[PDB]
RNA sequence: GCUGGCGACCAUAGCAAGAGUGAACCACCUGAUCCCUUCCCGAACUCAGAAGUGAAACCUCUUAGCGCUGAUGGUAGUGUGGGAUUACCCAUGUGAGAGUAAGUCAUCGCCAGCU
RNA sequence: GAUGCAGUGUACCCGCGGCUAGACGGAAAGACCCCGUGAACCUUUACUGCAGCUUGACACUGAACUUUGAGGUUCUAACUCUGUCCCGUGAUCCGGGACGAGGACCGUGUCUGGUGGGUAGUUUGACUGGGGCGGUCUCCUCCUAAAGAGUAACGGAGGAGUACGAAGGUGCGCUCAGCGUGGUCGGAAAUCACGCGUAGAGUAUAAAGGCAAAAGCGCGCUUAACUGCGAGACCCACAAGUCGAGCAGGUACGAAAGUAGGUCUUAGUGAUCCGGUGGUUCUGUAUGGAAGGGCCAUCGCUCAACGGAUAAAAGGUACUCUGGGGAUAACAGGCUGAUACCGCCCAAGAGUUCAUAUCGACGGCGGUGUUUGGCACCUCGAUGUCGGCUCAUCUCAUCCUGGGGCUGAAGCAGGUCCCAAGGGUAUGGCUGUUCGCCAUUUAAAGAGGUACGCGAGCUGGGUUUAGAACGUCGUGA
RNA sequence: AUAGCACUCUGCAAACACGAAAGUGGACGUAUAGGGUGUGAUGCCUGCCCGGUGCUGGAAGGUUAAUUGAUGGGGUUAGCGUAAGCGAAGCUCUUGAUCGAAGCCCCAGUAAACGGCGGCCGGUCCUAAGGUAGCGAAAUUCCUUGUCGGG
RNA sequence: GAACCCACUGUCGUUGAAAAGCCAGGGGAUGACUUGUGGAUAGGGGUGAAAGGCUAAUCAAGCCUGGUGAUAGCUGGUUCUCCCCGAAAGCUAUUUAGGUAGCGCCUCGGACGAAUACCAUAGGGGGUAGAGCACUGUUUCGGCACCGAUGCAAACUCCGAAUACCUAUGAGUACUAUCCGGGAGACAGACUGCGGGUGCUAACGUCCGUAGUCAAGAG
RNA sequence: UAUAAUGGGUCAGCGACUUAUAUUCAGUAGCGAGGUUAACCGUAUAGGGGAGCCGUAGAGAAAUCGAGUCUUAAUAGGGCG
């Protein structure tokens, strides 16, 4: 008899809106367990590290800063 | 484990909150300021049996 | 042409070693009266000041020393069609990683002082 | 596992007497095995009723004297006699009468506690390389998972069924770990001071994704671990789950711009029904109230078989039965060849010396389809056998006889290898045996395939129905 | 099954059985009789255990039913109150003190009652107690075609 | 030891002379014996020197008639013709696993037309193949845990494709997409190639992803 | 599945999606902001019979309001119309 045989339910993480798409305020952009992407301009962060848009515009990804962090922002 | 308790408004409105508590580390009755929607003011709430 | 502040950028821009700067600015610097301060200490924070020094520190300059960047060519992998089954071959499209030649001791913007 | 398909060989048309190798021959919707939220009967400390037995209270049920509500003594008139006598009456039933022995007891009705396989109705999960035994059943993290999401196995590894009034909020402030020098006990390693390189420390707890405006570590003040909501999205069969700017009211911390709707995040959970507690400008069976119901808030689940059949449930059947399945096991066939058997390559060495006369370690490569196995493709509206008897047919990896090479072959014998399938190739004791051991023979008493050849050719000793007994297991069947 | 043996129940309107009852069998019998249970002529015999379940005998201690209904709390209205509210009696909803048997808990006996007669390396642990006579590879022995003797 | 009552062995018989027998042998045969006539016991009952035996060729609960056309998630069967379209054997839950329910896939009617798809161009995130040793582990040889060489990894990563996937614009081709309603079936799949787990890099083996064929398709 | 998986020896005759009620959808006809009767009476498929049913208004648990209503301190926001 094996001592294995368990696993957890899926969580459906990942990027929901890619670069170049238009969003409205409140749209969820990234679902993530940790902070792989950071919040840029017009982007807010939830209590579970979810990134969402706070204004209408176009999504844009970039790499910025002295630590080389990945940022996502919304251009109005 | 942790026991359940009610915090009852001292204004006499009957409003209450519910929470848990460690009886060993907290033998005394709990008292804390909270909002009371019945009178729309902050007042002191005191511990009581949850029954 | 120097000094200070605030940004763009985040190593071709960083570390390391060596050398300079006191007019102004900055830095150490004097003591602790009042404001304020240390689970103790005017060491840090703070106040009241210029008798000393550019020693340290911060800036500027030089060096390829460490680091970082990095081709061209080839190789591995791979979508579609065909031929084979120890995982290859042909046609067509695509194309790394590592390594080699080589490069680098940054580049810009706003304001205020001194020549 | 083919009379009927492909290739090929053979074969003029039709009877009669025999024979049983095949037509998976005929016969009985398999009885073995599994399944169905099928059946019957049996057992018990399975669940739940009832009969029977038993306890007390009330009624039938009365009187007179005593003692510390109860107990005692006495009586007769209720009531009992399957005791005697008389009458109906010609009668061991029955009724009436007279006696006698008992007597408010016994017994019966209603209510009530106990006991209750005597009897009755039922329950006793699923997954599963057949079923049983074992393990598992809900949630979180990683891999499998093929660079969006999702993705199975009785695949490989680990965790959860909590904790905290601060370990929450805010303002201000601070950086770990390691090594090296010195410095009392003090050292491998307690604390102190100074250096070197450096995230390897820490984050209540498993792993992963993260963490300098530190999300890590301290101090002061505090309760936003608030009320009413909520544009817009993620995920999704449903029921559920997740993120959220912003608006109003009341707060906390900051000089202020501001931050705060619990904790770095992802586990720490349970629908509906039925009840309990607080509040309420709801309802209220003629009317006024009330009881009860509604609405808002909250409490009672290892319902863990975790979408939870009931408030309440275990076993046996060889005494068995029905509906089904070759969807699924035991025999034989099939695929495979781990295992089994046979052959070959290399060669440490053994063989007085000499690897190869004969053996040959450590390793390597194949063949066959006689073994033990793996799978579940055929057959469950039946393919019905362990051994013996009778009768066979084929293979060659040859037991004897025939022909040869080498030899550590003097001769006689022997060893090893090559060619060769024409013929031949024991009787008994023991046991159901196949096998094996033993006795005595023979030139020899070979190894295998043929549904482990052959039971519509024979037998029926073994296994495997119903009877009975022993050992052992069970309370028992 | 049996003759024989043992245990146990039954005092007569017997125990027991059939039947809803009336009644009937037991029996026109009476403990040398009748029912139930086990063993199985005869010979020699029949060891230990009462912790468990059962049965028998005690106890009046604890627990407990129907019945009973002391207290306490509500609903309603005469009235008293500016109002809020208070509010007897009478009806009614509920709460439930006290009394209360058998059984069970407790204490003994009983195995020809149902049952049991050990472990781990002489010792030790544990039991209610650890197998007496007799027999033994047996209708019981897996290993096993045990070993030896006879045929 | 005859009659009479039984039923131990064997042959035959087995669509029999016979729905239990014949033949040759066998046991008891004054007793707990055999037998005629007439009576009693009735179905959860009877009777049983006890085999679950017997109770009219029927017994782990007789036969007959009623409830009754019991129920059966199971097996079988389902009858004339032509035209059009055309599946699935998956996910989730289930005392559920060969049943069923919601969704996915089919068909018919209505609404509404480019909102759809193929391809080109542009924008975008990734951590697989490959590779590497910078972390975590593991490996060989030297020098003194470090230093120089040297290998390996599903649960290692300083790196890192091709394809797939999301969005916007656009030519050409095509009854495309979407919404609202009526009716379903199906929830046992198989093989082959490619990427894998398990198994022995066995199986016409088993479990997933992806494409083709069969299923439902002849030549 | 030629299957060595099931069923049928052959012929003739018989043999299996019905009936009643309720409800929803689609066709078709009458009337149309309206439509329609049931039991019953009736020498009776006529004619009477308007009780009742469907449509015409939602929101809210409900009392209550009503083109609005519920939640709320809110005329804010939001849900159903």
From Swiss-Prot, chain A:
Alphabetically ordered keywords of this record: Ribonucleoprotein, Ribosomal protein
InterPro entries: Ribosomal_bL27, Ribosomal_bL27_CS
Record carries keyword Nucleotide-binding: no
GO biological process, one term: translation
Gene3D superfamilies registered for this protein in UniProt: 2.40.50.100
Positions of the UniProt region annotated as Disordered: 1-12
One GO cellular component, as annotated: cytosolic large ribosomal subunit
Molecular function GO terms recorded: structural constituent of ribosome
Protein family according to the UniProt entry: Belongs to the bacterial ribosomal protein bL27 family.
NCBIfam families documented for this protein: L27
Family matches, as HAMAP family: Ribosomal_bL27
Annotated protein name in UniProt: Large ribosomal subunit protein bL27
Gene: rpmA
